[PDB]
Structures are given as C-alpha cells and as structure tokens.
Ligand binder design. Structure first.
Ligand SMILES: NC(=O)C1=CN([C@@H]2O[C@H](COP(=O)(O)OP(=O)(O)OC[C@H]3O[C@@H](n4cnc5c(N)ncnc54)[C@H](OP(=O)(O)O)[C@@H]3O)[C@@H](O)[C@H]2O)C=CC1
Ligand SMILES: NC(=O)C1=CN([C@@H]2O[C@H](COP(=O)(O)OP(=O)(O)OC[C@H]3O[C@@H](n4cnc5c(N)ncnc54)[C@H](OP(=O)(O)O)[C@@H]3O)[C@@H](O)[C@H]2O)C=CC1
Lengths: 375, 376
C-alpha cells in the first residue's frame, strides 16, 4: 500500500514546493513498528523546516483539493542559508502520536502492537510511519493521540530549562514569549516545584492568560515601565538564568541589564567589573528575526548562547531523560497539557488560508495536524 | 615619612577629581615588604578606574605643576554605573614593579630585601607600596622595573587565552585588536608553541606590524574581502574560540558567522540547526563602546560572554597560575616584551596633553609611569 506524507522541497531554482507525496508504506522490520499517526503539532521548529526561508507572501496554490501544492519563492539573500537542503525532498514534523497497527517480530515491537504511542521520529506529517520500537513512548491509559501529540519537544524543553538552571548553579529563571504552549507548561512546573519564575510577554492578553493560570510575575515588554517591572521581578525572584525564544532584538540584553541592577541592590563592595554572580541568557528560539543588539551595562560575569533540546538530553543521559519523560507521562493532561486552536488534515496544512493563521505563531493559535483526519 | 599616590574621586556632585595625595608611608608588618615603585603601566583597565564614566571632553586642569588636579563631569546617565564608588577616594594602578626597600621580620619578607619585584597589588600609581611578601614576583637577573612593569595583566591574559582554549576543548584561536601589546605577545606564544592563531586588526598598518613579527594569519576588518579572508583563515586554522577586545559592534558575530561557514565546508549531512561544533567568543575588552550587534546565522552551537583574568587564575588554581607566572619570568624580555611610547612622572599622568595621547588606547602608544620620576 501507499499513503501520503508532506514534503518540502527548496530547489536550486529558488522555488519552494510543498506537496503531499504518495509514499509506499513499509512493513516493519523486527525492531520496528508501523504507527498510524493521528496527531502531530505544528511547532515553530516544524514551520522552519516546512517553509524554510520562502517569502510566503509569494505563495500560490495549485494541485487539487485532495492533493494540494503550494509554491513560493525564496529571496536571493536567503538562498545561502538553504544550501544544505537544496534539491532535497524533506519530510516534516518532529513529533506525533498515533496507534501501532503493525509490529515487527521482536518482543519489544510486539509489546507495542495496538498501543497508542508518541514518537519524536521526524517525518511525522505522514499518515503512517515505520519507526523503531525503542523510539516510542507508550501513552497512559485513556490518553488519546491528541493528548500525547506534543509529549517531547515542549515538555522536555520546559523541564530541561529547569534542569539547566539547577545544573548551572542558578535558583530561579526568566522565560520569554511566556504565553506560548511551552511557557504555560514551564509556569505549571515552576508553581508546582516552588521555583521562582519571571514570565515575559508582549501583550496584556498574554499576561492575563498566565495570571489566570497562577503566574506570580508577568512582565509585559510592551509596557512603558517594563525595565522597572522586570528589575523588581528579578529582585523578587533572584533569577540569574533566562530562556529567550525571541533571539533577535533587545530582550536578551534587557534581561541581563535588569539582572545586574537587581544583583547590585545587594552589592557589599564596589566592584570594578560588576557583580561576580554569573548571569546566563539562552536563545532557544528565533521568533524575532532582527539582529540581536545590546549594550554591555552588566559587568563581565555573563554569557549568552544557543540551547537545543537534543544535545541537552544527550548531556543528562538516558536514565535522567527517562525520569523526565516519566514525569511528562504522569502529568500529561495537567502540567503538560497543550492547547490547540484547530485540528487540520494534511491537505489543510497546504491551504493558504490555514497557513495565514498558523504561520503567525500567535498566542493560543497552535494548530494540530491529524494526518489521517475523518478517515 | 609620607609620599605621593594618585587618587581618583567621583563625587555624588557628578564631578571627577584626580589628584596626587600625600599618604603616610607604612612600615611593613612581619609578612609585608615596602616597594619603591619605579614602573607601572597605564593599561585600559587602569584608565577605566582612573577616569570612570567621566566625559573627558569636559576635563579641566587646576592645581599646581608638582601637584596637579583634573576635574571633569560624569553624565547623569552614567551615575548609576558609578554608584559603587561615589565619594570614595580610589587608588589606581593594577600592576607595577620596583625595588624592595624595607622588609618585615618574616623570612619570606626578608628574602625579598633589595630585590626587584613586580606585584599586582592595586594602588601601584604610588611612590611606595606596602604589600604582602606573598604577592611579589621576583624578577630575573638583569630585569629593570621597566622590564617587569607589565608582568601580570597582559602576559597572564595571553597565556590564559591559550589555557581557556585548551580547557574548553578547542585546538586553535582567534584574537581581535591583535596589534595591541597583548596581541603581540599572544602571537609570539602561538609561534613558539605551535598554536594556530587568527589575528584580526582594524588598520592595514597593524597587519603589516604583525606580519613583520611572524604572524601566520592576519585579517583586517577594514578589508573589502574581510569575511572571505576570515573564513579562509578559519578553514586553515580550525579555530573555534575567539577573544574579542572590542566588545561592541559587529566583530563577535562576524567571527561566529565565519566560523560556522568554515565548519560547514566539512558538513556531511544537513543540520536543521547548523554544525554541532561549539563556537565560543569571549568579550574580554570593551574598546568599542557601541552596542553589540549580530545576526544569528551560525546555528545553535555557540556562546558569547565576558572573560576576566582574576576569575580565570582562581579557576585554574595557584599551582597552575604559578607555572604560568614562571613562564612569564623565563620569557620576560622575549615572548612577553612590552613596548611603551613614553615614560612619565606621576604629575604628568594628570597633564591633559598627556591624557589626550594615552587615553586613545592606540597601537604602540602605551605609556609607562615611573611614580618616583623627578622625586626625592
Ligand atoms: N531550542 C529548542 O530545542 C526548542 C525551542 N522551542 C521554542 O520555544 C518557543 C515556543 O514554542 P511554542 O510553545 O510551541 O510556541 P507557541 O506557538 O505556542 O507560542 C508562541 C508565543 O510567541 C509569541 N511571539 C510570536 N512572535 C514573537 C515575536 N517576534 N516576539 C515576541 N514574541 C513573539 C506569541 O505571542 P503573540 O500572540 O504576540 O504573537 C506566542 O505567545 C518557540 O520559539 C520555539 O521555537 C521549543 C522547543 C525546543
Ligand atoms: N578581561 C581581562 O581580564 C583583560 C583584558 N585586557 C584587554 O586586552 C586589550 C588589549 O590591551 P593592551 O594590549 O594593553 O592594549 P594596547 O593599548 O596595547 O592596544 C590596544 C589596541 O586596541 C586597538 N583599539 C583601540 N580602540 C579600538 C576600537 N574602538 N575598536 C577596535 N580596536 C581598537 C588599538 O588600535 P588603534 O591604533 O587602531 O586604535 C590597539 O591596537 C584591552 O581591551 C584590555 O582591556 C587585557 C588584560 C586582561
């Protein structure tokens, strides 16, 4: 049999073509299972791969309603960033969940037969995926695929922020774009675990959503007293590590500047180079594509850098990663609940009206894909 | 007796006052020595303390020729940054060298009597300093105080860059403002030790200088092909750690961008997030006072942060710190040689004409103070 899977092709011509390809469905080998995928989130990392650097204002629809095609043009300036995927037909979708419908002969694979599972196997925007049994997370009794669709990326990143805070000797943390699904989870984790947290948003609606969910400190970057508000929240929390999803713009430096201000309130001597307390900002997303810019008014005890989930998980090791996953399974519908504004079919992923919404990365407007919808 | 020491005072009034204070000279306790300081450099770290956030374009001279005063205004916007030192009379000068003229009773202190020593004691812009025996570095035979005046800050930082490179798992390095005194030392270390090094300068004449000193790789930020030149140098050297003296501006991000370009020439697969090889830029100076700005076109495996000598020495421990200091002594006049364009008295530090030159932190224009020059 064959079935459909989304593909994203950036051509050397400068064209993006998004399509639903007909792909033969493998039978699983001894150590594999075949999963009928029923739920897979559209996260920012997936959008990055889906559209690459295409200018989506140039998008045009062709194909048929059942087999849509979207083409768009990548600007000349962006082509070098695409070099490594030129002329490659890329499957899309980091993670998802569904039902195991075939299992290879091994006892590991056989033990998953008929179970509802989640996996971060890539190519999850697909009707069927043949995956190793050891890459599957069995979901709790009563969890639907939609309940388990987002078990890996956001939950483990949220837990990994706290883990990183501890490992690197900090006691409280700051998180930006905090009304994201990930931010909502982090807030739940911090409230439950007694970890002081500064949430940073950019609209009062976002601040209300978090306050409604019990957030103690919410600072609005849009506010004319933001720096005052943030400094006061940092005095309160003692946070010296930050996770910034924006990446570009000024927020990273603003946070460093406010941390140093907060630290200096308790400074006992004059320090030539500021506080000796290390302040860290991790840029773990790139929602703001403008240049990163900051003044260095925070002394010498600071760092900023990238953060990625998979290298993190490799660092803490598989046992500790498992302890984190166990928590996610146990709290799947509470601490690690995700909200989606819409559930759509594979064909609907390539509807220009759908793209127009979900490609905003707007608060409360995450879409869930059901590759098999209505069938 | 008493003798002179420079003082820098930023007052709550918004005024910087620079002066020579008359300070009673201590007699050393058992574990101390008294040094007559004959050589102390004006390094950028010192100038930071000396002038603070004062706008020196507003500086004014008063006092007398032998006892000069300089006053200047700190702008209101900088006063928060000065908060920790308001109304404090600050001694200045991290490091220097001189002769031990009195020693406390302990054998450790007695062993230094009459020796030429260097110390990083602070308050070195002073005719005499009473400091612990255990903070003195005994200089080698035939070294004048001038020869040892700069034994700590630049030599140990240069060695510390190489140490940090190794500690953090890198095999080669990049260094900016490379025609600095420190840069010239770093290039000699790397030549002698066989470390691949990319030197970045801002003027072609600085590239000429380093090439004349044997530098293998020198890139000029003013070059119209800078990014290509830097990327090629990074392919050649495999460097994945940089020390940036500029801090502000674009150079840090440029380096990261070129490092990722160089790494991706060996890319086996397509990484959604670029190379997995960690690239690190330490901003160890702030010569460029503008905002730091960069595009993040270098993947996720990167870091940028501050770097300071004293936290570093504390991290490596006293034994390893002592081994670095021993190498500095051994190569004091070769690898770790420092050039000064002028030697000035204590009173001349406060001459606005002298300030106008030394405060540029211009290549080959480092000034050496002899606190006892012209004095009894
Ligand atoms: N490094 C890593 O391994 C990983 C990173 N991530 C990152 O975490 C972040 C959250 O993911 P997720 O919970 O799925 O996101 P959501 O789609 O659920 O929420 C996104 C949030 O970002 C805000 N936002 C969008 N654009 C900007 C902007 N330019 N500046 C400031 N805020 C903005 C939105 O607010 P508004 O309504 O105002 O648009 C919204 O609240 C993303 O950057 C994602 O890439 C997630 C997992 C791992
Ligand atoms: N973090 C730490 O613990 C320490 C840091 N340092 C730092 O090392 C650096 C070198 O010190 P040192 O060798 O004594 O300095 P020098 O005075 O010998 O040389 C300074 C160099 O900086 C260049 N420069 C000056 N201003 C700028 C600018 N705006 N942008 C780019 N380049 C500039 C000069 O070139 P030009 O002629 O073009 O002006 C010159 O080549 C300094 O930043 C110093 O603070 C040193 C020791 C320890």
């Amino acid at each position: 049999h064959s079935a459909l899977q989304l593909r994203s092709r950036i051509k050397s011509s400068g064209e993006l073509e998004l399509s639903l390809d007909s792909i033969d469905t493998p039978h699983p080998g001894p150590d594999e299972v075949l999963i009928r995928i029923e739920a897979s989130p559209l996260n920012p990392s997936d959008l990055g791969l889906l559209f690459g650097a295409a200018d989506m204002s140039t998008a045009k629809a062709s194909g048929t309603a059942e087999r849509p095609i979207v083409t768009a043009r990548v600007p000349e300036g962006a082509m070098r960033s695409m070099a490594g995927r030129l002329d490659a037909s890329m499957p899309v979708g980091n993670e998802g969940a569904g039902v195991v419908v075939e299992a290879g002969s091994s006892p590991a694979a056989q033990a998953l037969m008929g179970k509802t599972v989640a996996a971060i196997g890539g190519a999850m925007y697909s009707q069927y995926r043949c995956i190793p049994a050891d890459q599957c997370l069995v979901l709790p009794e009563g969890a639907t695929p939609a309940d388990g669709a987002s078990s890996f990326v956001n939950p483990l990143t949220a837990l990994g922020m706290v883990e990183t805070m501890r490992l690197e000797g900090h006691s409280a943390l700051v998180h930006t774009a905090a009304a994201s699904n990930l931010g909502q989870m982090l807030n739940q984790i911090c409230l439950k675990d007694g970890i002081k947290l500064v949430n940073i948003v950019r609209k009062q609606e976002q601040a209300d959503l978090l306050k409604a969910q019990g957030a103690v400190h919410v600072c609005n970057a849009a506010s004319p007293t933001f720096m005052q508000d943030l400094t006061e929240a940092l005095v309160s929390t003692g946070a010296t590590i930050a996770f910034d999803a924006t990446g570009g713009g000024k927020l990273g430096g603003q946070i460093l500047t406010c941390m140093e201000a907060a630290l200096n309130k308790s400074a006992r001597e004059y320090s030539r180079y500021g506080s000796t307390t290390h302040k860290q900002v991790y840029l773990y997303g790139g929602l703001d594509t403008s240049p990163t810019e900051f003044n260095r008014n925070f002394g010498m005890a600071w760092g900023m850098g990238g953060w990625l989930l998979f290298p993190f998980l490799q660092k803490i090791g598989r046992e500790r990663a498992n302890a984190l996953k166990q928590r996610v399974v146990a709290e799947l519908k509470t601490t690690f609940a995700s909200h989606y504004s819409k559930e759509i079919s594979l064909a609907e992923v390539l509807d220009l009206d759908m793209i127009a919404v979900y490609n905003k990365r707007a608060t409360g407007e995450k879409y869930l894909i059901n590759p098999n919808k209505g069938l």
